[PDB]
Design a protein around this ligand. Structure first.
Ligand SMILES: Cc1cc2nc3c(=O)[nH]c(=O)nc-3n(C[C@H](O)[C@H](O)[C@H](O)COP(=O)(O)OP(=O)(O)OC[C@H]3O[C@@H](n4cnc5c(N)ncnc54)[C@H](O)[C@@H]3O)c2cc1C
Length: 429
Protein backbone atom coordinates (compact mmCIF):
# COMPACT_ATOMS: atom_id res chain seq x y z
CA UNK A 1 0.00 0.00 0.00
CA UNK A 2 3.02 2.24 -0.94
CA UNK A 3 2.45 5.53 -2.78
CA UNK A 4 3.31 5.87 -6.46
CA UNK A 5 5.67 8.86 -6.73
CA UNK A 6 6.44 10.08 -10.25
CA UNK A 7 8.90 12.91 -10.96
CA UNK A 8 8.59 14.78 -14.28
CA UNK A 9 11.95 15.99 -15.57
CA UNK A 10 15.48 14.81 -14.86
CA UNK A 11 17.48 17.99 -14.51
CA UNK A 12 19.43 18.79 -11.33
CA UNK A 13 16.27 19.52 -9.35
CA UNK A 14 14.19 16.47 -10.31
CA UNK A 15 17.22 14.20 -9.92
CA UNK A 16 18.05 15.69 -6.51
CA UNK A 17 14.49 15.26 -5.25
CA UNK A 18 14.26 11.67 -6.51
CA UNK A 19 17.43 10.64 -4.69
CA UNK A 20 16.26 12.36 -1.52
CA UNK A 21 13.04 10.36 -1.63
CA UNK A 22 15.06 7.14 -2.09
CA UNK A 23 17.05 7.98 1.05
CA UNK A 24 13.76 8.38 2.94
CA UNK A 25 12.78 4.91 1.72
CA UNK A 26 10.44 5.76 -1.17
CA UNK A 27 10.10 3.99 -4.49
CA UNK A 28 10.50 6.66 -7.17
CA UNK A 29 10.03 6.85 -10.95
CA UNK A 30 11.36 9.73 -13.06
CA UNK A 31 10.05 10.64 -16.53
CA UNK A 32 12.07 12.98 -18.73
CA UNK A 33 13.15 13.67 -22.30
CA UNK A 34 16.55 12.45 -23.48
CA UNK A 35 18.18 15.68 -24.67
CA UNK A 36 17.78 19.26 -25.89
CA UNK A 37 19.96 21.84 -27.64
CA UNK A 38 23.69 22.06 -26.96
CA UNK A 39 24.05 24.32 -23.91
CA UNK A 40 27.21 24.82 -21.87
CA UNK A 41 27.05 26.73 -18.60
CA UNK A 42 29.57 28.25 -16.23
CA UNK A 43 29.80 26.43 -12.90
CA UNK A 44 31.66 27.40 -9.74
CA UNK A 45 33.74 25.24 -7.40
CA UNK A 46 30.82 25.12 -4.95
CA UNK A 47 28.28 23.77 -7.45
CA UNK A 48 30.27 20.68 -8.36
CA UNK A 49 30.75 19.36 -4.83
CA UNK A 50 27.31 20.70 -4.02
CA UNK A 51 26.27 18.43 -6.90
CA UNK A 52 27.95 15.45 -5.24
CA UNK A 53 26.57 16.46 -1.85
CA UNK A 54 23.22 15.67 -3.45
CA UNK A 55 24.50 12.48 -5.08
CA UNK A 56 24.81 13.57 -8.72
CA UNK A 57 28.62 13.81 -8.66
CA UNK A 58 29.01 10.78 -10.91
CA UNK A 59 27.11 12.60 -13.69
CA UNK A 60 29.58 15.38 -13.13
CA UNK A 61 33.25 15.18 -14.05
CA UNK A 62 32.98 13.72 -17.56
CA UNK A 63 30.54 16.57 -18.29
CA UNK A 64 32.62 19.30 -16.59
CA UNK A 65 35.96 20.53 -17.94
CA UNK A 66 38.32 23.21 -16.59
CA UNK A 67 38.78 26.40 -18.57
CA UNK A 68 40.20 29.88 -18.30
CA UNK A 69 37.79 32.84 -18.30
CA UNK A 70 38.26 36.47 -19.32
CA UNK A 71 35.95 38.81 -17.38
CA UNK A 72 35.17 42.31 -18.71
CA UNK A 73 33.13 44.32 -16.21
CA UNK A 74 33.28 47.83 -14.70
CA UNK A 75 36.13 48.80 -17.03
CA UNK A 76 38.42 46.00 -15.77
CA UNK A 77 40.02 43.35 -17.97
CA UNK A 78 40.28 40.54 -15.41
CA UNK A 79 41.65 37.01 -15.96
CA UNK A 80 40.01 34.68 -13.41
CA UNK A 81 40.17 30.87 -13.51
CA UNK A 82 39.40 27.71 -11.46
CA UNK A 83 35.84 27.92 -12.70
CA UNK A 84 34.69 25.19 -15.04
CA UNK A 85 32.31 24.66 -17.95
CA UNK A 86 29.40 22.23 -17.78
CA UNK A 87 28.12 20.61 -20.96
CA UNK A 88 24.42 20.08 -20.30
CA UNK A 89 24.30 17.47 -23.06
CA UNK A 90 26.77 15.25 -21.19
CA UNK A 91 25.29 16.33 -17.84
CA UNK A 92 21.62 15.45 -18.35
CA UNK A 93 22.43 12.18 -20.11
CA UNK A 94 24.76 11.44 -17.21
CA UNK A 95 22.16 12.32 -14.55
CA UNK A 96 20.16 9.23 -15.53
CA UNK A 97 23.03 6.92 -14.48
CA UNK A 98 23.08 8.34 -10.95
CA UNK A 99 19.32 7.86 -10.73
CA UNK A 100 19.42 4.21 -11.83
CA UNK A 101 22.36 3.73 -9.46
CA UNK A 102 20.14 5.04 -6.65
CA UNK A 103 17.30 2.68 -7.57
CA UNK A 104 15.17 5.14 -9.57
CA UNK A 105 13.21 4.09 -12.66
CA UNK A 106 14.02 6.43 -15.57
CA UNK A 107 11.21 6.25 -18.14
CA UNK A 108 12.40 8.24 -21.14
CA UNK A 109 9.72 10.20 -22.98
CA UNK A 110 8.11 13.59 -23.44
CA UNK A 111 5.08 14.21 -21.24
CA UNK A 112 1.98 15.06 -23.28
CA UNK A 113 -0.47 16.04 -20.56
CA UNK A 114 -1.27 15.46 -16.90
CA UNK A 115 -4.90 15.05 -15.88
CA UNK A 116 -6.85 14.91 -12.61
CA UNK A 117 -7.76 11.22 -12.93
CA UNK A 118 -8.26 9.78 -9.43
CA UNK A 119 -4.54 10.36 -8.88
CA UNK A 120 -2.29 11.87 -11.54
CA UNK A 121 -2.70 10.75 -15.13
CA UNK A 122 0.65 11.35 -16.80
CA UNK A 123 0.14 10.83 -20.53
CA UNK A 124 3.31 10.54 -22.62
CA UNK A 125 3.88 11.31 -26.30
CA UNK A 126 4.20 7.59 -27.14
CA UNK A 127 0.71 6.95 -25.76
CA UNK A 128 1.75 5.44 -22.41
CA UNK A 129 -0.15 6.54 -19.32
CA UNK A 130 1.66 6.44 -15.97
CA UNK A 131 -0.44 6.74 -12.81
CA UNK A 132 0.93 8.83 -9.93
CA UNK A 133 -0.37 9.14 -6.40
CA UNK A 134 2.15 12.00 -5.99
CA UNK A 135 3.65 14.17 -8.72
CA UNK A 136 6.94 16.10 -8.55
CA UNK A 137 6.95 18.81 -11.24
CA UNK A 138 10.59 19.34 -12.16
CA UNK A 139 10.55 20.22 -15.85
CA UNK A 140 12.40 23.49 -15.32
CA UNK A 141 11.32 26.55 -17.27
CA UNK A 142 9.50 24.16 -19.62
CA UNK A 143 7.00 23.66 -16.82
CA UNK A 144 3.37 24.47 -17.70
CA UNK A 145 2.72 28.21 -17.47
CA UNK A 146 1.02 29.07 -14.19
CA UNK A 147 0.42 32.53 -12.79
CA UNK A 148 3.49 34.19 -11.29
CA UNK A 149 3.85 35.22 -7.66
CA UNK A 150 6.63 37.62 -8.73
CA UNK A 151 8.12 38.51 -12.10
CA UNK A 152 11.19 40.66 -12.65
CA UNK A 153 12.17 42.78 -15.64
CA UNK A 154 11.35 40.78 -18.77
CA UNK A 155 14.63 39.30 -19.98
CA UNK A 156 15.72 37.26 -23.01
CA UNK A 157 18.95 35.35 -23.56
CA UNK A 158 19.87 34.92 -27.24
CA UNK A 159 22.21 32.04 -28.02
CA UNK A 160 24.50 31.21 -30.96
CA UNK A 161 25.95 27.70 -31.23
CA UNK A 162 28.49 26.63 -33.85
CA UNK A 163 31.53 24.43 -34.47
CA UNK A 164 35.17 25.54 -34.60
CA UNK A 165 38.65 24.02 -34.36
CA UNK A 166 39.18 21.77 -31.31
CA UNK A 167 41.92 22.11 -28.69
CA UNK A 168 41.82 25.69 -27.32
CA UNK A 169 39.35 25.91 -24.42
CA UNK A 170 38.25 29.23 -22.94
CA UNK A 171 35.26 31.27 -21.78
CA UNK A 172 34.48 34.94 -21.25
CA UNK A 173 32.00 37.47 -19.86
CA UNK A 174 31.71 41.07 -21.05
CA UNK A 175 29.42 43.89 -20.02
CA UNK A 176 27.74 45.56 -22.99
CA UNK A 177 25.94 48.89 -23.14
CA UNK A 178 22.44 47.32 -23.06
CA UNK A 179 23.15 43.80 -21.85
CA UNK A 180 25.88 41.33 -21.08
CA UNK A 181 27.27 38.34 -22.93
CA UNK A 182 28.63 34.96 -21.90
CA UNK A 183 30.69 32.87 -24.32
CA UNK A 184 32.53 29.55 -24.24
CA UNK A 185 34.63 27.33 -26.49
CA UNK A 186 34.93 23.67 -25.54
CA UNK A 187 38.02 21.53 -26.11
CA UNK A 188 36.26 19.58 -28.88
CA UNK A 189 35.65 22.93 -30.63
CA UNK A 190 31.97 23.42 -29.78
CA UNK A 191 31.25 27.13 -29.38
CA UNK A 192 28.65 29.02 -27.37
CA UNK A 193 27.63 32.67 -27.20
CA UNK A 194 24.69 33.98 -25.21
CA UNK A 195 23.69 37.60 -24.79
CA UNK A 196 21.21 38.70 -22.14
CA UNK A 197 19.01 41.68 -22.92
CA UNK A 198 15.69 43.27 -22.15
CA UNK A 199 12.93 41.50 -24.07
CA UNK A 200 11.47 44.78 -25.37
CA UNK A 201 12.17 45.96 -28.90
CA UNK A 202 14.04 42.84 -30.02
CA UNK A 203 13.36 41.70 -33.60
CA UNK A 204 10.99 38.87 -34.37
CA UNK A 205 12.10 35.38 -35.39
CA UNK A 206 13.15 36.44 -38.89
CA UNK A 207 15.46 39.16 -37.59
CA UNK A 208 17.25 37.29 -34.79
CA UNK A 209 20.03 35.69 -36.85
CA UNK A 210 21.17 39.05 -38.28
CA UNK A 211 20.82 40.65 -34.85
CA UNK A 212 23.07 38.09 -33.16
CA UNK A 213 25.58 38.15 -36.03
CA UNK A 214 26.04 41.91 -35.77
CA UNK A 215 26.55 41.73 -31.99
CA UNK A 216 29.12 38.93 -32.26
CA UNK A 217 30.86 40.77 -35.11
CA UNK A 218 31.13 43.85 -32.89
CA UNK A 219 32.92 42.08 -30.02
CA UNK A 220 36.73 42.07 -29.81
CA UNK A 221 36.35 39.29 -27.23
CA UNK A 222 34.51 37.11 -29.75
CA UNK A 223 37.34 37.71 -32.25
CA UNK A 224 40.11 36.74 -29.82
CA UNK A 225 38.40 33.66 -28.41
CA UNK A 226 37.00 32.25 -31.67
CA UNK A 227 38.96 31.72 -34.87
CA UNK A 228 35.93 30.52 -36.86
CA UNK A 229 32.79 32.44 -35.92
CA UNK A 230 30.19 30.97 -38.34
CA UNK A 231 28.45 34.35 -38.36
CA UNK A 232 25.95 33.26 -41.01
CA UNK A 233 25.28 29.58 -40.21
CA UNK A 234 25.40 29.47 -36.38
CA UNK A 235 22.26 28.07 -34.78
CA UNK A 236 20.13 30.81 -33.19
CA UNK A 237 18.03 30.21 -30.06
CA UNK A 238 16.05 32.55 -27.81
CA UNK A 239 15.48 31.74 -24.11
CA UNK A 240 13.27 33.54 -21.64
CA UNK A 241 15.62 34.31 -18.74
CA UNK A 242 13.20 36.48 -16.72
CA UNK A 243 13.27 36.14 -12.93
CA UNK A 244 10.09 34.18 -12.11
CA UNK A 245 8.63 32.98 -8.82
CA UNK A 246 5.84 30.48 -9.48
CA UNK A 247 2.32 31.40 -8.38
CA UNK A 248 1.67 27.91 -6.95
CA UNK A 249 4.44 25.50 -5.99
CA UNK A 250 2.86 22.77 -3.83
CA UNK A 251 -0.49 20.97 -3.55
CA UNK A 252 -2.08 18.11 -1.61
CA UNK A 253 -0.36 15.61 -3.90
CA UNK A 254 2.15 17.58 -5.94
CA UNK A 255 5.15 19.86 -5.63
CA UNK A 256 7.20 22.05 -7.94
CA UNK A 257 11.00 22.07 -7.56
CA UNK A 258 13.83 23.81 -9.33
CA UNK A 259 13.21 26.32 -12.11
CA UNK A 260 9.57 25.21 -12.13
CA UNK A 261 9.35 26.71 -8.63
CA UNK A 262 11.68 29.70 -8.90
CA UNK A 263 14.43 30.95 -11.17
CA UNK A 264 16.40 34.18 -11.30
CA UNK A 265 18.35 35.35 -14.32
CA UNK A 266 21.67 33.59 -15.02
CA UNK A 267 24.14 36.41 -14.21
CA UNK A 268 25.29 34.68 -11.01
CA UNK A 269 26.78 31.70 -12.81
CA UNK A 270 25.11 29.75 -10.01
CA UNK A 271 21.70 28.69 -11.33
CA UNK A 272 22.21 24.95 -10.89
CA UNK A 273 23.11 25.49 -7.23
CA UNK A 274 20.07 27.72 -6.73
CA UNK A 275 17.84 25.07 -8.31
CA UNK A 276 19.34 22.44 -6.00
CA UNK A 277 18.57 24.70 -3.02
CA UNK A 278 14.91 24.72 -4.01
CA UNK A 279 14.82 20.90 -4.00
CA UNK A 280 16.91 20.40 -0.84
CA UNK A 281 13.94 20.15 1.52
CA UNK A 282 11.38 19.00 -1.05
CA UNK A 283 11.72 15.35 0.12
CA UNK A 284 10.70 16.16 3.70
CA UNK A 285 7.73 18.19 2.43
CA UNK A 286 6.64 15.21 0.31
CA UNK A 287 7.29 12.88 3.26
CA UNK A 288 4.90 15.01 5.32
CA UNK A 289 2.32 15.13 2.54
CA UNK A 290 2.33 11.30 2.37
CA UNK A 291 2.88 10.19 6.01
CA UNK A 292 0.89 12.94 7.80
CA UNK A 293 -1.45 14.39 5.14
CA UNK A 294 -3.45 16.03 7.97
CA UNK A 295 -0.46 18.43 8.10
CA UNK A 296 -0.51 19.37 4.39
CA UNK A 297 -1.30 23.00 5.22
CA UNK A 298 1.88 23.31 7.27
CA UNK A 299 3.90 21.39 4.70
CA UNK A 300 2.57 23.55 1.88
CA UNK A 301 3.35 26.76 3.76
CA UNK A 302 6.84 25.49 4.57
CA UNK A 303 7.67 24.93 0.89
CA UNK A 304 6.06 28.12 -0.46
CA UNK A 305 7.76 30.39 2.05
CA UNK A 306 11.16 28.72 1.64
CA UNK A 307 10.93 29.00 -2.16
CA UNK A 308 9.96 32.68 -1.97
CA UNK A 309 12.79 33.55 0.43
CA UNK A 310 15.30 31.65 -1.75
CA UNK A 311 14.04 33.49 -4.85
CA UNK A 312 14.38 36.87 -3.18
CA UNK A 313 17.86 36.08 -1.86
CA UNK A 314 19.16 34.91 -5.22
CA UNK A 315 17.50 37.90 -6.93
CA UNK A 316 19.33 40.30 -4.62
CA UNK A 317 22.63 38.48 -5.08
CA UNK A 318 22.20 38.93 -8.82
CA UNK A 319 21.28 42.59 -8.34
CA UNK A 320 24.57 43.20 -6.52
CA UNK A 321 26.44 41.71 -9.47
CA UNK A 322 24.59 44.11 -11.78
CA UNK A 323 25.46 46.89 -9.35
CA UNK A 324 29.19 46.20 -9.59
CA UNK A 325 29.00 47.58 -13.16
CA UNK A 326 29.32 51.30 -12.36
CA UNK A 327 30.15 52.63 -15.83
CA UNK A 328 26.67 52.36 -17.37
CA UNK A 329 24.72 55.03 -15.56
CA UNK A 330 22.42 56.16 -18.35
CA UNK A 331 21.38 52.72 -19.59
CA UNK A 332 17.85 51.34 -19.01
CA UNK A 333 19.01 47.70 -19.07
CA UNK A 334 21.39 48.23 -16.14
CA UNK A 335 19.40 50.77 -14.08
CA UNK A 336 16.34 48.52 -14.17
CA UNK A 337 18.43 45.54 -13.03
CA UNK A 338 20.49 47.34 -10.38
CA UNK A 339 17.34 48.22 -8.43
CA UNK A 340 15.44 44.95 -8.74
CA UNK A 341 13.81 43.34 -6.72
CA UNK A 342 14.43 46.22 -4.27
CA UNK A 343 17.34 47.93 -2.51
CA UNK A 344 17.28 45.78 0.63
CA UNK A 345 20.70 44.66 1.84
CA UNK A 346 21.43 40.92 1.83
CA UNK A 347 21.81 41.01 5.64
CA UNK A 348 18.99 43.11 7.08
CA UNK A 349 19.48 45.33 10.13
CA UNK A 350 18.29 44.07 13.52
CA UNK A 351 15.17 45.51 15.16
CA UNK A 352 14.63 43.92 18.56
CA UNK A 353 11.45 45.96 19.05
CA UNK A 354 9.88 44.13 16.07
CA UNK A 355 10.78 40.57 17.17
CA UNK A 356 7.73 38.32 17.49
CA UNK A 357 7.01 34.90 18.98
CA UNK A 358 4.73 33.09 16.54
CA UNK A 359 3.68 29.53 15.75
CA UNK A 360 5.29 28.68 12.41
CA UNK A 361 6.25 25.59 10.37
CA UNK A 362 9.41 23.74 11.46
CA UNK A 363 11.27 20.56 10.43
CA UNK A 364 11.43 17.73 12.99
CA UNK A 365 12.27 14.06 12.34
CA UNK A 366 11.66 14.35 8.61
CA UNK A 367 8.23 15.95 8.95
CA UNK A 368 6.92 19.51 8.83
CA UNK A 369 5.46 20.24 12.24
CA UNK A 370 4.56 23.50 13.95
CA UNK A 371 6.24 25.18 16.90
CA UNK A 372 6.59 28.52 18.61
CA UNK A 373 9.58 30.16 16.91
CA UNK A 374 11.10 33.62 17.16
CA UNK A 375 10.46 35.81 14.08
CA UNK A 376 13.08 38.50 13.47
CA UNK A 377 14.04 41.03 10.81
CA UNK A 378 16.83 38.72 9.58
CA UNK A 379 14.72 35.53 9.83
CA UNK A 380 11.18 36.27 8.55
CA UNK A 381 10.46 32.51 8.74
CA UNK A 382 11.52 32.22 12.38
CA UNK A 383 14.27 30.61 14.43
CA UNK A 384 13.14 27.56 16.41
CA UNK A 385 16.19 26.47 18.42
CA UNK A 386 19.96 26.80 18.73
CA UNK A 387 21.52 23.33 19.15
CA UNK A 388 18.38 22.11 20.92
CA UNK A 389 17.72 25.25 22.99
CA UNK A 390 14.30 26.55 22.00
CA UNK A 391 14.28 30.35 21.84
CA UNK A 392 10.57 31.20 22.09
CA UNK A 393 10.35 30.54 25.89
CA UNK A 394 13.36 32.77 26.56
CA UNK A 395 12.05 35.54 24.29
CA UNK A 396 8.58 35.31 25.83
CA UNK A 397 10.17 35.76 29.27
CA UNK A 398 12.44 38.57 28.02
CA UNK A 399 9.48 40.37 26.48
CA UNK A 400 7.70 39.90 29.84
CA UNK A 401 10.53 41.79 31.57
CA UNK A 402 12.43 38.91 33.15
CA UNK A 403 16.17 39.77 33.37
CA UNK A 404 18.37 37.99 30.85
CA UNK A 405 20.60 36.43 33.52
CA UNK A 406 17.58 34.72 35.12
CA UNK A 407 16.11 33.69 31.74
CA UNK A 408 19.21 31.69 30.77
CA UNK A 409 20.21 30.53 34.27
CA UNK A 410 19.00 26.98 33.62
CA UNK A 411 21.27 26.24 30.67
CA UNK A 412 24.91 25.21 30.70
CA UNK A 413 27.37 28.10 30.63
CA UNK A 414 28.19 27.36 27.00
CA UNK A 415 24.52 27.31 26.01
CA UNK A 416 24.07 30.54 28.01
CA UNK A 417 26.85 32.20 25.99
CA UNK A 418 25.37 30.83 22.76
CA UNK A 419 21.96 32.31 23.54
CA UNK A 420 23.48 35.68 24.51
CA UNK A 421 25.34 35.93 21.20
CA UNK A 422 22.15 35.25 19.24
CA UNK A 423 20.27 37.94 21.17
CA UNK A 424 23.03 40.44 20.42
CA UNK A 425 22.76 39.70 16.71
CA UNK A 426 18.99 40.21 16.93
CA UNK A 427 19.41 43.70 18.40
CA UNK A 428 19.09 43.01 22.14
CA UNK A 429 22.28 44.70 23.30
C1 LIG B 1 20.08 31.48 -20.46
C2 LIG B 1 20.40 30.70 -19.22
C3 LIG B 1 21.73 30.53 -18.83
C4 LIG B 1 22.05 29.81 -17.68
N1 LIG B 1 23.39 29.68 -17.33
C5 LIG B 1 23.68 29.01 -16.25
C6 LIG B 1 25.08 28.88 -15.89
O1 LIG B 1 26.03 29.34 -16.51
N2 LIG B 1 25.29 28.16 -14.73
C7 LIG B 1 24.31 27.58 -13.94
O2 LIG B 1 24.66 26.95 -12.94
N3 LIG B 1 23.00 27.70 -14.30
C8 LIG B 1 22.71 28.39 -15.39
N4 LIG B 1 21.38 28.51 -15.77
C9 LIG B 1 20.35 27.94 -14.90
C10 LIG B 1 20.19 26.44 -15.02
O3 LIG B 1 20.05 26.03 -16.38
C11 LIG B 1 18.94 26.03 -14.23
O4 LIG B 1 19.01 26.67 -12.96
C12 LIG B 1 18.77 24.53 -14.00
O5 LIG B 1 19.08 23.78 -15.17
C13 LIG B 1 17.36 24.22 -13.54
O6 LIG B 1 17.30 22.85 -13.14
P1 LIG B 1 15.97 22.04 -13.24
O7 LIG B 1 16.21 20.60 -12.96
O8 LIG B 1 14.95 22.76 -12.34
O9 LIG B 1 15.52 22.25 -14.74
P2 LIG B 1 16.23 21.66 -16.03
O10 LIG B 1 17.69 21.55 -15.80
O11 LIG B 1 15.87 22.59 -17.18
O12 LIG B 1 15.63 20.22 -16.16
C14 LIG B 1 14.35 20.00 -16.77
C15 LIG B 1 14.42 18.63 -17.41
O13 LIG B 1 13.09 18.25 -17.84
C16 LIG B 1 13.11 17.95 -19.22
N5 LIG B 1 11.82 18.31 -19.80
C17 LIG B 1 11.37 19.52 -20.23
N6 LIG B 1 10.14 19.52 -20.69
C18 LIG B 1 9.77 18.19 -20.59
C19 LIG B 1 8.59 17.50 -20.93
N7 LIG B 1 7.52 18.08 -21.47
N8 LIG B 1 8.54 16.16 -20.69
C20 LIG B 1 9.61 15.57 -20.15
N9 LIG B 1 10.77 16.12 -19.79
C21 LIG B 1 10.79 17.44 -20.03
C22 LIG B 1 14.34 18.65 -19.81
O14 LIG B 1 14.76 17.95 -20.98
C23 LIG B 1 15.33 18.52 -18.64
O15 LIG B 1 16.01 17.27 -18.63
C24 LIG B 1 21.03 29.25 -16.91
C25 LIG B 1 19.70 29.41 -17.30
C26 LIG B 1 19.38 30.14 -18.44
C27 LIG B 1 17.93 30.29 -18.83
Amino acid sequence: AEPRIVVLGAGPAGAATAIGLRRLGYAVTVVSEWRRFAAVEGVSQRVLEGLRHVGLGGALRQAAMPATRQVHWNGQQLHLNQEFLLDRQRFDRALRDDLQRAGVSVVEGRVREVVRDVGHGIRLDDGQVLQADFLVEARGRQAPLAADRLRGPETVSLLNVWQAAPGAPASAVESLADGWAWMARLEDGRCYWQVTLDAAGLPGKAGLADYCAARRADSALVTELFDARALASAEVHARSSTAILAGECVGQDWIRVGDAAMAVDPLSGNGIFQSLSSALQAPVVINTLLRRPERAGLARQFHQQRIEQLFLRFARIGRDFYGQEQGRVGQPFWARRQGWPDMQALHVAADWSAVRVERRPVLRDGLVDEAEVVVTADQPLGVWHLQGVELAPAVRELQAGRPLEAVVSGLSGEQQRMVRRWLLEQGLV
